[PDB]
Design a protein around this ligand. Structure first.
Ligand SMILES: [Mg+2]
Ligand SMILES: [Mg+2]
Ligand SMILES: [Mg+2]
Ligand SMILES: [Zn+2]
Lengths: 196, 190, 161, 134, 205, 52
RNA sequence: GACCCCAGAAAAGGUGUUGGUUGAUAUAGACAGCAGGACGGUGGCCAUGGAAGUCGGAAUCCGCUAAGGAGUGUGUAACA
């Protein structure tokens, strides 16, 4: 079945490369399956998104290169976790609708945080049994109105560094928005053209 | 099966001078000299380039057992290069449940005294290997820095401290006291 | 200070969960050091203190007395940072010079206690003499010949009954 | 914020339950509905499934108004009192309607598969009705 | 209670079957020789696997029972109680005598029957398991476990014959198609092309 | 009152190891066969049990 | 370890090394490492005090897909 599935990928990529003259190569960050489901459903009206092995992409491209030259321009750009999005709509509107649907990604434990986040001093609303986590992270907190209350704003994690499990689960419990990100366009390809 | 040849090459950085006195490699760099003889292994050591300064280890007609000595020699030489360029710094975090551990550094960081390990009266005294310097941290609460050039000696000193801090007749899964090597890195981080 | 606050938080959450509301017939029951409903010391050595004593004697150092000690205890305890170099309380852990400020509780309650402990336990006789003279501690006879932890018990028993 | 955060879900159904279930266990979050609230909530939620019947509730500072999601086993057992393709065909109209789909015809395939708790053989080589639903 | 198997490991005696000259033999330990789905047709289980012994020795009936149960538990746990058939192709027809010492000495040393062993030869099949093709791994593992209850060395063979029958798997299909075999029970009936023509009329009709 | 960051470091050397079933030797967690002569380098290993 | 009788050994193991057999993956990118993802119907049906993939009896499907098992484990009373 592996050979048949690879063959199916070949026919799929050649058919869609022939069908859509406008394709953008997009870099996939630490994006989840649910994020991808949301993106596909958002773009279900106009665009179609495919991703796979870069080597498979490049091999199919080189195989179809005689039938359609000028696709060799995409060849020294299939690097890293990237992929194709096929569209027929205008550049800035597709770019707008791709930057518009960026999920507020939760802080996954063990990952690097790209954003510097400081939590405020507010009525958290949590029950007075989650205080052990505030004690573990090193925040002095008091009970106000029968709920947890932080006296001062405190930073939690800097930029470009690893995150801890307790630090992450506290933010999940507070349900605040951590660093958020999504798939980002690397380049575009309009009928034999390369742009930034 | 005697493979005709197995060879491996290590690149020498520009500011490092390596001399071969037989199988005795002398690596000289900004941090000093590391010397080590590989006379227990029969290999063909040679220096090739003039700007690259490659060092090749060759072993001819080697069976399975001695075919693994080539990478061992290359890794030891790379360790010598790392030691004389960036040095080795082992950071050990002394962890204790209840009793704080009093670590006293004696003369020029060559002697370490562990006083209150598990709250007892016997004082552990550990002598670091020659050329290895010990320190008590300033950016960290309970941390020891072991700096040196010979990775062998540095890590052996770290193991000496760690195995001096040993719990006996107790559930070691419960009693987690002692000093453990939190991380292994370099000086100057270059 | 962190451990003290941990104990305070744990007691507070206990009484919050297993008690009635702040609007309850008993009222507000959560204990705050600024309210002076939590104390420190050691009963074995015969000495103890609260937030009231240090605040009162610092006000005397600096009707109206109750007001002064009451609103000074709030600066005595909390996440408030006091610079001994500045001589005025601050609400920022970073000075305009960028130097970190020790918090007020450790700065002007725990610092003298730590200093007298170290002087007595390490037998620094001139240090203990200076500390007694600065703290106007009144020792008695038969206490002036002892040393170590019994001298510590004596000095602490007289200074913080 | 509707004066309360009551978007929690409840998994009680069939028999009354009331305090036997976790209705009083989650009650102190709002404290308003309590033993009257779970009584009327169950009175409304008796039908739309006699199973566990996961649902959501909305609080009006005294009472609760219930919305019942279209869970697979929930709607299957509720409609139950054979393939019965007609009843699932009409039952996909009011569905949650996302199902990570590309077409509406796949939806009846997915639920004719999940109703396997055989009707897999119609889904395997279905050729009629994949356009009929939308 | 029973003497160790090493005392009777070897075929040091002429065969001594339970007959009118050897009366009062106790019953053997093994009683059921076919397990699993015994009723399955021949075409259901196209894989046969054998535990071929390497030692011309004696295998005790108790050991045969234990190995049979060891194979049965694993095969049931791995392939269900309806996915395999086991046939133990050794029967304990040899009687071993024992001279109990309580006259005294070696006088009148001839011994009363004690137990039954099966004499097996080099290359002889001890156990056979027939099953579906994809369960080859499970069959080999089951026979591998069952080997541990026998003294000598045994080998696992994946027989070329279809199931338990005496024809190769690759010729079985077209042989049944061209009617040289008719399936019945767990095996087949070979139909030679000589005999009455009325049998051939029953066939091809 | 060991902080969890140090708990992991201590467990890495003390608890999180593999044990040979035949000679009880303390081996690294990814070991397949025992390193000691007296057990035939047998590959029968079990994780060192936790305290929980 | 070191020679018929013969003066000593077995089943079972070894990621010590060597040879051999059979099978498989792979420049359409093996393998191992480091790094991402690891989803929706569905917290699938019985089972119950709670078993949401992971105590069990049965079933083994679908769509999104590049892939994600109504699940190989660790774990929770269940979750996480
Ligand atoms: Mg290395
Ligand atoms: Mg003991
Ligand atoms: Mg005889
Ligand atoms: Zn072992």
């Amino acid at each position: 079945d592996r050979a048949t599935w690879k063959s199916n990928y070949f026919l799929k990529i050649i058919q869609l490369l022939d069908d859509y003259p406008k394709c953008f190569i997009v870099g996939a960050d630490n994006v989840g399956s649910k994020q991808m489901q949301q993106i596909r459903m958002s773009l279900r009206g106009k665009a179609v998104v495919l991703m796979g092995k870069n080597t498979m992409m490049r091999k199919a491209i080189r195989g179809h290169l005689e039938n359609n030259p000028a696709l060799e321009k995409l060849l020294p750009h299939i690097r890293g976790n990237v992929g194709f999005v096929f569209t027929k709509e205008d550049l800035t509107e597709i770019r707008d609708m791709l930057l518009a649907n960026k999920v507020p990604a939760a802080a996954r434990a063990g990952a690097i945080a790209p954003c510097e986040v400081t939590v405020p001093a507010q009525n958290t609303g949590l029950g007075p049994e989650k205080t052990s986590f505030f004690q573990a992270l090193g925040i002095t907190t008091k009970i106000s109105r029968g709920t947890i209350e932080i006296l001062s704003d405190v930073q939690l994690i800097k930029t470009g560094d690893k995150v801890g499990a307790s630090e992450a689960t506290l933010l999940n419990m507070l349900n605040i928005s951590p660093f958020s990100f999504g798939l980002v366009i690397q380049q575009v390809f309009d009928n034999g053209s390369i742009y930034n | 099966m005697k493979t005709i040849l197995s060879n491996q090459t290590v690149d020498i950085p520009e500011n490092v001078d390596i001399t071969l006195k037989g199988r005795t490699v002398i690596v000289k760099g900004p941090r000093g000299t590391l010397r080590r003889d590989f006379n227990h292994i029969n290999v063909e050591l040679s220096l090739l380039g003039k700007k690259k300064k490659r060092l090749r280890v060759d072993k001819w007609w080697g069976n399975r057992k001695e075919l693994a000595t080539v990478r061992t020699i290359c890794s030891h030489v790379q360790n010598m290069i790392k030691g004389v360029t960036l040095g080795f710094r082992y950071k050990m975090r002394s962890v204790y449940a209840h009793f704080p551990i009093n670590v006293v550094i004696q003369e020029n960081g060559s002697l370490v005294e562990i006083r209150n390990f598990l709250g007892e009266k016997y004082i552990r005294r550990v002598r670091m290997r020659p050329g290895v310097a010990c320190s008590v941290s300033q950016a960290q609460k309970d941390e020891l820095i072991l700096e040196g050039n010979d990775i062998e000696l540095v890590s052996n000193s770290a193991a000496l401290i760690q195995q001096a801090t040993t719990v006996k007749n107790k559930d070691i899964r419960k009693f987690l006291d002692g000093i453990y090597v939190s991380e292994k890195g370099t000086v100057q981080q270059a | 200070y962190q451990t003290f606050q941990r104990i305070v938080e744990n007691v507070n959450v206990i009484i919050s969960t297993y008690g009635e509301g702040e609007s309850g017939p008993m009222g507000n029951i959560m204990i705050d050091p600024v309210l002076g409903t939590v104390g420190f010391g050691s009963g074995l050595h015969g000495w103890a203190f609260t937030l009231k004593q240090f605040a009162e004697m610092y006000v005397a150092k600096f009707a109206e007395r109750a007001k002064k000690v009451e609103d000074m205890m709030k600066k005595l305890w909390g996440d408030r940072y006091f610079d001994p170099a500045n001589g005025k309380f601050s609400k920022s852990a970073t000075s305009p010079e960028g130097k970190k400020l020790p918090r007020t509780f450790c700065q002007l309650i725990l610092d003298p206690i730590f200093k007298v402990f170290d002087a007595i336990m390490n037998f620094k006789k001139e240090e203990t003499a200076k500390l007694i003279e600065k703290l106007d501690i009144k020792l008695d006879s038969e206490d002036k010949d002892k040393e170590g932890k019994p001298l510590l018990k004596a000095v602490m028993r007289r200074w913080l009954p | 914020p509707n004066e309360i955060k009551v978007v929690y879900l409840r998994c009680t159904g069939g028999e009354v339950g009331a305090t036997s279930a976790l209705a009083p266990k989650i009650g102190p979050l709002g404290l308003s509905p309590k033993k009257v609230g779970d009584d009327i909530a169950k009175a409304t939620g008796d039908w739309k499934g006699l199973r566990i019947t996961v649902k959501l509730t909305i609080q009006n500072r005294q009472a609760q108004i219930e919305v019942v999601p279209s869970a697979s086993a929930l709607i299957i057992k509720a409609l139950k009192e054979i393939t019965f393709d007609e009843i699932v065909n009409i039952a996909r109209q009011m569905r949650h309607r996302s199902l990570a789909r590309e077409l509406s015809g796949t939806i009846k395939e997915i639920l004719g598969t999940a109703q396997s708790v055989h009707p897999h053989d119609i889904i395997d080589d279905i050729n009629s009705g994949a356009v009929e639903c939308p | 209670g029973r003497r160790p198997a090493r005392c009777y490991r070897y075929c040091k005696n002429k065969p001594y079957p339970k007959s009118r000259f050897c009366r009062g033999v106790p019953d053997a330990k093994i009683r059921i020789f076919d397990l699993g789905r015994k009723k399955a047709k021949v075409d259901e289980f196209p894989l046969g696997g054998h535990m071929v012994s390497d030692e011309y020795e004696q295998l005790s009936s108790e050991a045969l029972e234990a190995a049979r149960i060891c194979a049965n538990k694993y095969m049931v746990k791995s392939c269900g109680r309806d996915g395999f058939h086991m046939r133990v192709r050794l029967h304990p027809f040899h009687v071993i005598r024992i001279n109990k010492m309580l006259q005294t000495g070696m006088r009148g040393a001839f011994g009363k029957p004690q137990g039954t062993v099966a004499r097996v030869h080099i290359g002889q099949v001890i156990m056979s398991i027939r099953t579906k093709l994809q369960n080859e791994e499970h069959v080999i593992e089951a026979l591998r476990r069952a080997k541990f209850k026998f003294p000598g060395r045994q080998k696992i063979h994946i027989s070329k014959k279809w199931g338990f029958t005496k024809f190769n798997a690759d010729e079985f299909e077209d042989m049944v198609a061209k009617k040289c075999l008719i399936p019945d029970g767990c095996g087949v009936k070979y139909v030679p092309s000589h005999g009455p023509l009325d049998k051939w009329r029953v066939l091809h009709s | 009152i060991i902080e969890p960051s140090l708990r992991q470091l201590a467990q890495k050397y003390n608890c999180d190891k593999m044990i040979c079933r035949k000679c009880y030797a303390r081996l690294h967690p990814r070991a397949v066969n025992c390193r000691k002569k007296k057990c035939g380098h047998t590959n029968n290993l079990r994780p060192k049990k936790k305290v929980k």
